[PDB]
């Protein structure tokens, strides 16, 4: 501020990037001003007894959910391990590249089975205004909402 040295020596993306799920709500395993590239692993479960199939939708942003932050990507992952209700499960894995490019991989991990989307950050360009207004009340006050909308449909399920 008064001292002429206001600079951050880190390759960071401005927002905490997560996923819009079962009824359109978030889970953020990332963080605001995150030192990308980064591989995080959030284990979600399923709703029906023996083998659902998850429709994942990526939203960069959002206060305890269905506000309206930055939608990009989305994919359907299917081929689930059959166990009896709330126990069949999937790892929504987030492998981000250095220019804020999200390789989103849903893994049926006991089954060792993944499908992935590489999201290029071209449509939106939120920058200073959407990150200062949305993440100070969202990602900060969202894992502080207390895994906001993480306790969702059936335990941790995006169905």
UniProtKB/Swiss-Prot annotation:
User: Which residues form the Glycyl lysine isopeptide (Lys-Gly) (interchain with G-Cter in SUMO2) crosslink?
Assistant: 128
What positions does the cross-link Glycyl lysine isopeptide (Lys-Gly) (interchain with G-Cter in SUMO1) connect? 128
Q: What induces it?
A: Constitutively synthesized.
Residues found modified as N6-acetyllysine: 128, 140
- Point out residues bearing the modification Omega-N-methylarginine: 85
Q: Where in the cell is it found?
A: Cytoplasm; Melanosome; Nucleus, Nucleolus; Cell membrane
Q: Return the annotated region ranges for Substrate-binding domain (SBD).
A: 10-125
Q: Which residues carry this modification: Phosphoserine?
A: 157
Which positions, given as ranges, span the membrane?
A: none
Q: Which residues carry this modification: N6-succinyllysine?
A: 128
The UniProt PTM text for this protein says: Acetylated. ISGylated.
Its biological purpose: Molecular chaperone implicated in a wide variety of cellular processes, including protection of the proteome from stress, folding and transport of newly synthesized polypeptides, chaperone-mediated autophagy, activation of proteolysis of misfolded proteins, formation and dissociation of protein complexes, and antigen presentation. Plays a pivotal role in the protein quality control system, ensuring the correct folding of proteins, the re-folding of misfolded proteins and controlling the targeting of proteins for subsequent degradation.
Give the protein family.
Belongs to the heat shock protein 70 family.
The record's comment about this protein's domains reads: The N-terminal nucleotide binding domain (NBD) (also known as the ATPase domain) is responsible for binding and hydrolyzing ATP. The C-terminal substrate-binding domain (SBD) (also known as peptide-binding domain) binds to the client/substrate proteins. The two domains are allosterically coupled so that, when ATP is bound to the NBD, the SBD binds relatively weakly to clients. When ADP is bound in the NBD, a conformational change enhances the affinity of the SBD for client proteins.
Q: How does it assemble?
A: Component of the chaperone-assisted selective autophagy (CASA) complex consisting of BAG3, HSPA8/HSC70, HSPB8 and STUB1/CHIP. Identified in a IGF2BP1-dependent mRNP granule complex containing untranslated mRNAs. Interacts with PACRG. Interacts with HSPH1/HSP105. Interacts with IRAK1BP1 and BAG1. Interacts with DNAJC7. Interacts with DNAJB12 (via J domain). Interacts with DNAJB14 (via J domain). Interacts (via C-terminus) with the E3 ligase STUB1 forming a 210 kDa complex of one STUB1 and two HSPA8 molecules.
Q: What is this protein called?
A: Heat shock cognate 71 kDa protein
Which organism is this protein's natural source?
Answer: Rattus norvegicus
Gene label: Hspa8
Show which stretch of the intact protein is covered: 385 to 543 of 646
